Design a protein around this ligand. Structure first.
Ligand SMILES: c1nc(N2CCNCC2)c2cc[nH]c2n1
Length: 330
């Protein structure tokens, strides 16, 4: 049944992967409300789609700046991945379009903010609460890896909490469709697997290491490897020593020791049994996997009807088309 679901999901993905979506919608169809985040070559705004009244998060990217920072192909690959994937815990890309100045990606609005912010506000989660969130990541990585996608950007900041208290994964900035090995040093230091830091190639197993870090951080209220200098963080990561808080259950420690396995060939999620070594672990014994997928489990936290404040700026669109041919495939 899981095998049957994933086989169908692979077919669905490849159809969209090989034949991308047509350009939909225009700027004036959305009322601009508030800036939700800013970056070097773009910003994300809370918008209301006028005709439906639906609220969305619109990513506005400055074309000239994308071209300047050599981010053309990165932008296109990221869009291509977003429009092709379909899973409950991945943010829906609703519309994409472009004008003379900007590229626009209109995504599902996730109102409850980042898990980072939730951790900053409430501290460590109980093991049952950590397990609720962990279960959604497991199923998400199961789905993504079945499509040969490595995520390689798991961190609390990239996990947004929806009105039902469920995770919506944003930021496909480092996501890569790869069969076999790759080498790029990308991602936040705290969450990097030893094989990313070291000169050797890596595969999808890096996502499972990152899951180990996330579960540790949720249950402890701090990351397993931290220091002021990234090099010092790396030294701790490669060394293979983790200190577990005294309140960590035996089941939690065993799962974490197997996820935070320095030898990628011995790491849970990367053995012959695959995801089942994680899903069937004693720590996940109480987890109803179907119920999590269907979002039928009551969440630990429902956001109040969450984001940090940013200064507002109007969308300026030039009367002359910028970088037209460069973004033809967008
Ligand atoms: C267990 N069950 C799953 N379902 C929910 C019930 N209908 C079939 C698909 C999925 C989907 C991804 N991973 C899963 N693990």
């Amino acid at each position: 049944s899981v095998k049957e679901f994933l086989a169908k999901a692979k077919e669905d993905f490849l159809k969209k992967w090989e034949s991308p979506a047509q350009n939909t919608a225009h700027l004036d169809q959305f009322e601009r409300i508030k800036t939700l985040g800013t970056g070097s070559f773009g910003r994300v705004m809370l918008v209301k789609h006028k005709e439906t009244g639906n609220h969305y998060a619109m990513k506005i990217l400055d074309k000239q700046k994308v071209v300047k920072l050599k981010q053309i192909e990165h932008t296109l690959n990221e869009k291509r991945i977003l429009q092709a994937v379909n899973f409950p815990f991945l943010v829906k890309l609703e519309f994409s379009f472009k004008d003379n100045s900007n590229l626009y990606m209109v995504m599902e609005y996730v109102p409850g903010g980042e898990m980072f912010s939730h951790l900053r506000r409430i501290g460590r989660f109980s093991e049952p609460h950590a397990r609720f969130y962990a279960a959604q990541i497991v199923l998400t990585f199961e789905y993504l890896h079945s499509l040969d996608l490595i995520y390689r950007d798991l961190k609390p900041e990239n996990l947004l909490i929806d009105q039902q208290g469920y995770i919506q994964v944003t930021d496909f900035g480092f996501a890569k469709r790869v069969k076999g090995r790759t080498w790029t040093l990308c991602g936040t230091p705290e969450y990097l697997a030893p094989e990313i830091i070291l000169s050797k190639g890596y595969n999808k197993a890096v996502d499972w290491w990152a899951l180990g870090v996330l579960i540790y951080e949720m249950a402890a209220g701090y990351p397993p490897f931290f220091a002021d200098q990234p090099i010092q963080i790396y030294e701790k990561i490669v060394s293979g020593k983790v200190r577990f808080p005294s309140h960590f259950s035996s089941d939690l420690k065993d799962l974490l020791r197997n996820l935070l396995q320095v030898d990628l060939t011995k790491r849970f999620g990367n053995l012959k049994n695959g995801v089942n070594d994680i899903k069937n672990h004693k720590w996940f014994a109480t987890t109803d996997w179907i119920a999590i997928y269907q979002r039928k489990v009551e969440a630990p936290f429902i956001p109040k009807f969450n984001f940090d404040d940013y200064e507002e700026e109007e969308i300026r669109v030039s009367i002359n088309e910028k970088c037209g041919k460069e973004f033809s495939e967008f």
